[PDB]
Write a protein that binds this ligand. Sequence first.
Ligand SMILES: [Mg+2]
Ligand SMILES: [Mg+2]
Ligand SMILES: [Mg+2]
Ligand SMILES: [Mg+2]
Ligand SMILES: [Mg+2]
Ligand SMILES: [Mg+2]
Ligand SMILES: [Mg+2]
Lengths: 214, 212, 212, 211
Amino acid sequence: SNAMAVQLLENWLLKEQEKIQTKYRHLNHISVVEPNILFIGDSIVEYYPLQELFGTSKTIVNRGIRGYQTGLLLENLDAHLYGGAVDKIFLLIGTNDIGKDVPVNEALNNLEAIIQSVARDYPLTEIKLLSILPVNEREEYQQAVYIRSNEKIQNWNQAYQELASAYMQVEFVPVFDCLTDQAGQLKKEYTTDGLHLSIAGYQALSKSLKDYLY
Amino acid sequence: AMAVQLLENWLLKEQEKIQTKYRHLNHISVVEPNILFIGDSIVEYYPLQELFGTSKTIVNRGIRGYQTGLLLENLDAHLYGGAVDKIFLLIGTNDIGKDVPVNEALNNLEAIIQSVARDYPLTEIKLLSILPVNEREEYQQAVYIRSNEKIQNWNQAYQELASAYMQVEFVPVFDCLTDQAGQLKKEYTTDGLHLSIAGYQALSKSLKDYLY
Amino acid sequence: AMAVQLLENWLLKEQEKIQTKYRHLNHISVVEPNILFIGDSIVEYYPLQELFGTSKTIVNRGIRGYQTGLLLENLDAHLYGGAVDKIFLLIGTNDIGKDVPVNEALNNLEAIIQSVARDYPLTEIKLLSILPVNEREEYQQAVYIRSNEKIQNWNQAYQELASAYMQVEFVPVFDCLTDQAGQLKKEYTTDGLHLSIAGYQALSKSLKDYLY
Amino acid sequence: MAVQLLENWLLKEQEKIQTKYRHLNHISVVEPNILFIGDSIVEYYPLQELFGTSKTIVNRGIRGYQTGLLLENLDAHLYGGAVDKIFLLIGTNDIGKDVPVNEALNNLEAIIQSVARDYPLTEIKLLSILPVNEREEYQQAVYIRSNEKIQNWNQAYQELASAYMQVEFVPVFDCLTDQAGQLKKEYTTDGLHLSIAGYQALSKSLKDYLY
Ligand SMILES: [Mg+2]
Ligand SMILES: [Mg+2]
Ligand SMILES: [Mg+2]
Ligand SMILES: [Mg+2]
Ligand SMILES: [Mg+2]
Ligand SMILES: [Mg+2]
Ligand SMILES: [Mg+2]
């Protein structure tokens, strides 16, 4: 690598995120569907084949953005919310806070502020706060997994669970264990690069989430 | 006796026609019901779109004159959709009006609940309290043998049934609709039994939070 | 004669009740109609939501047994909204059924069109052809004195009236509902006059280019 | 060479999407009524939020795609037992890479023939390639594409469509141009890709072909 190229790639990620935020802000106004469920979060959400794995009878709208962290979501929360009859918001975020060494208390405070902001504007809407998903710690996946570890992820998940217990409208959704193998790693078949999910991974995640859609 | 029997025949014919309509519509409908409203004439004549709006797709499967037995026997006509979040059920005032024994009506309702629990396992049933009537003499032609004392007793039984089933929530709306004398408000009714638009506005306001 | 008068009285009472319902709903509806459907029982009973969907807000202002004169007299009950794009009007089969003189019905329709042109100047009116009936003897109870010959003559008059008014388009749907004998298809009808769900599917398909 | 490795980036991202689609084709829980196939403009198209879900429309677009890549990997883009229509938007990257028009048309003809045998009751809607905006400010995305080229390719697409009863040419180019014949500024992000206003205008133009 090359530090000039480092900056410009960081710049590439920022401009892609800004482009997607702009896209969502305009769709929020002109969309022809009413979201029953909004899926909000990071790359795992953006790339989730929601239609093809959950079907179309329940309208689930994607408001995920690659590389997102809790602070970015809080700052731009308006891009991720619309509709007159939102039953539930599914929130999957934090793996990138871990990958950037964001203090857990800062991430939590960010999540708490998101919950409170949603309560004001969407008072009858439930939030399903997903466990951060496991990673695969095999050497071959070190490039995507980076400083994430399943011990850190499990510690954050304990904190998310405690945060959920403080709000009647928030339910913690334990999906971590559904995606692990017997060594407590994200299953090889469920991953492309140790962090992101394969289609088998998304299928397994969807099976674990289905009941929470109702 | 003879003309009254022919009127009962009329009603049955109309109900059968509506059941056919519904079976056919369920098959080719261009919408996915988020919520199904099922019940008797108070449901059939409910102006759902104009009082709740269309953010949620709320589909009407009500039938005038319906009773719990008729609904059970024809339950297939009243259910469709791939992701029904909620079924709102308002029925029983015609069971009372026809002197159907409460235990029969409650067994019919339990069977409905168990059927939906099996076939629509993640769907919630919102079991409404039967609505109050107005017992004043001027409304006797519609109200007939119904009384608010009977209705409240049946509502207690509905509440108890709902308590036995995870997917069922009893929705107490009776009290929203009464005047200080415990009668369906005169302004809320057309004939002492059916609702005026003001009655439907009051009912809608009471149901709004149960939609989520 | 006593009972025939009572049946007339029954219908009159129900129509008045629906007019009151609509006047009240017009006042407090939570939706802005993009399209109003106005007319007789074929409109009242039209499953608009489940056949057209809800991408546009389509509001039902039909009344069973309606005739052009009753609609004109009560036109206020059928119209509301701050930006109505289209009004679909299906009416006249009960004028024919009651032997209303054609010139009277056409004068009534012209008055309705002129009223809407004044009060809803940016709204398009879609004036549907009266639908065919089935003339087979099994359907004589509903069909009565209606005939496809009379209906087609009235439709020619409707087309002429529409041609005179800028914001009125005649919508020829009659031929979309007939079999090879020129009758309303048996599968399209419940009683020879009213539509089955298949008949409403065919009518909805033929209206789609005028709606969207 | 950084450009060699950017070419390599794109190829690897395309292969990853092909893998994803091939697996989805097997385990999808929906029966697509309409498949949208093509390049970046398709991948990034907000189909659900702009067309709604009265019909099940499935996205099988891939960024940077060209007619040859599509033909070689056509299996990744097709599935379902009841597909009413396929919408195909592709060619702007063939123009951008200076692929001979004859080569691109033979690839498209090969694609149409393959779909014909496997999906005989399915209509193919072959879209006109969309206009670009030729202003200098957009040159990083637009590159060697010109509206003159695009219109010439669209004439050829129209002729190819005329040779198959199952294929209808869908002329949307003119719906997206300004008075100078450029892609309208408010319809574009970078002179080539569409803004949401652009996708809404495209959707409005396509509605009569979808429903
Ligand atoms: Mg909680
Ligand atoms: Mg649960
Ligand atoms: Mg319960
Ligand atoms: Mg009072
Ligand atoms: Mg709920
Ligand atoms: Mg006159
Ligand atoms: Mg052709």
